[PDB]
Amino acid sequence: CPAERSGHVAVSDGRHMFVWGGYKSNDFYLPREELWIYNMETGRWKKINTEGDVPPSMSGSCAVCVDRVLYLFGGHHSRGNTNKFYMLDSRVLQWERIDCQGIPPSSKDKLGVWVYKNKLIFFGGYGYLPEDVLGTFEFDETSFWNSSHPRGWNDHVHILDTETFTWSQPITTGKAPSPRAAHACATVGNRGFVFGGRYRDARMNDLHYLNLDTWEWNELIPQGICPVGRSWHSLTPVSSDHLFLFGGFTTDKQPLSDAWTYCISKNEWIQFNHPYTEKPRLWHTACASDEGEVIVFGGCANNLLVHHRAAHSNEILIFSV
Ligand SMILES: CC(C)(C)c1ccc(CSCC(=O)NCc2cn(CC(=O)O)nn2)cc1
């Protein structure tokens, strides 16, 4: 039922997948008030129209679902990037914009988030120069000609404490990943993994994790064959020991349909064979089910940067991992 889209968000409790936002070609954004719910057990869709402080229609936003409470940060609306923070209690649904304390992150999109205890921990993204902070920001030289305000990538780590809805920045040790956007984040225990992403002229192949207890960065160097570097991929925990990688976009502008699992305990990648080899996706979403499956929705089958030829999808791809 839902219309095709890329750059949407999809979050889940393992049974119901909530889809919001994104854009398509016919860069018209999809209706801001619509919240699509996909039942992973029955395969049925349901649309509900939300009220309250409905966020602007956006692509590249960052969302999480914790105890059936939906949190949304950042994104790109018709007038640029944002750093607003929204909440939707899904337990008539009403959005609520939270006026957080502390210094918020810079306005940006295409980032990632880890969830650990009371903390939402955001990393990276693409957006405007920080108006103020810890980390590094690198301008995208091409942004000075295609836009009113220039933009760049960051390697910032920001915590939102949901106990007080206060922003802060942790003091991290170790070598942080370079600034990036369109990377993929995944959390298992107190480890926030990040893989790939776009930085300058490369879509990268490196894998790191941030210890969310000690705030120490670690680079992971798996031995043997590793997936090609990419952006606009998904990285989804499917167990306490495996992360599922699917899709994305290479430095060479190749849409990707390969799937892998990263085994955390063995520190190796395992390529996953599946029936969607002719169905590459970039800027899709991926959500894990309680039954071990990974549910991919939306995204684009070809180079979405050629807008007038972009092949956005509304297909559900089910990976039984
Ligand atoms: C309007 C139209 C539909 C044509 C459209 C335009 C632009 C975009 C995004 S491109 C601009 C940008 O924000 N560049 C920084 C960036 C990119 N990436 C991902 C990667 O390049 O792999 N990570 N950081 C998408 C659609």
SS (H, E, C) 39-84: ECCCCCEEEEECEECCCCCCECCEEEEECCEEEEECCEECCEEECC
Q: Is 140 a pocket residue for ligand 1 (Cβ < 6 Å)?
A: yes
Q: Are 114 and 187 in contact (CB under 8 A)?
A: yes
Best mutation site among 6, 24, 305 for ligand 1, i.e. most ligand atoms within 8 A of its Cβ?
A: 305
CA 74, CA 269: separation in Å to the nearest integer? Answer: 31
Q: Are 38 and 297 in contact (CB under 8 A)?
A: yes
Q: Is 110 a pocket residue for ligand 1 (Cβ < 6 Å)?
A: yes
Q: Are 33 and 21 in contact (CB under 8 A)?
A: no
- Phi first, then psi, for residue 82 (nearest 5°) are -140, 160
Classify residue 303 by its DSSP letter. Answer: -
User: What atom of ligand 1 comes closest to residue 25's alpha carbon?
Assistant: 3
Residues paired with 39 in a beta bridge: 16
Closest CA to ligand 1's atom 7: 305
Query: How many separate helices (H) and strands (E) can be counted in the chain?
Result: 1, 32
The alpha carbon of 305 and the centre of ligand 1 are apart by a number of angstroms equal to 7
CA 121, CA 37: separation in Å to the nearest integer? Answer: 25
CA 318, CA 316: separation in Å to the nearest integer? Answer: 6
Question: Side-chain half-sphere of 261: how many Cα atoms within 13 Å?
Answer: 20
Best mutation site among 148, 154, 231, 281 for ligand 1, i.e. most ligand atoms within 8 A of its Cβ?
A: 231
Q: Which fold is adopted by the domain 222-321?
A: Thrombin, subunit H (2.40.10)
The alpha carbon of 240 and the centre of ligand 1 are apart by a number of angstroms equal to 33
Other C-beta atoms lying within 10 Å of the C-beta of residue 189: 12
Say if residue 93 is exposed, middle or buried (CB neighbours under 10 Å; 0-12, 13-18, 19+).
middle
CA 206, CA 65: separation in Å to the nearest integer? Answer: 27
Cβ partners under 8 Å of residue 79, min gap 6: none
Other C-beta atoms lying within 10 Å of the C-beta of residue 202: 15
Elucidation technique: X-ray
CA 177, CA 58: separation in Å to the nearest integer? Answer: 26
| Nearest of 97, 129, 6 to residue 59 by alpha carbon | 6
Q: Which part of the chain is CATH 2.40.10?
A: 222-321
Q: Residue 275 corresponds to which amino acid?
A: P
Q: Are 228 and 255 in contact (CB under 8 A)?
A: no
Secondary structure of residue 221 in the 3-state scheme: coil
Other C-beta atoms lying within 10 Å of the C-beta of residue 52: 16
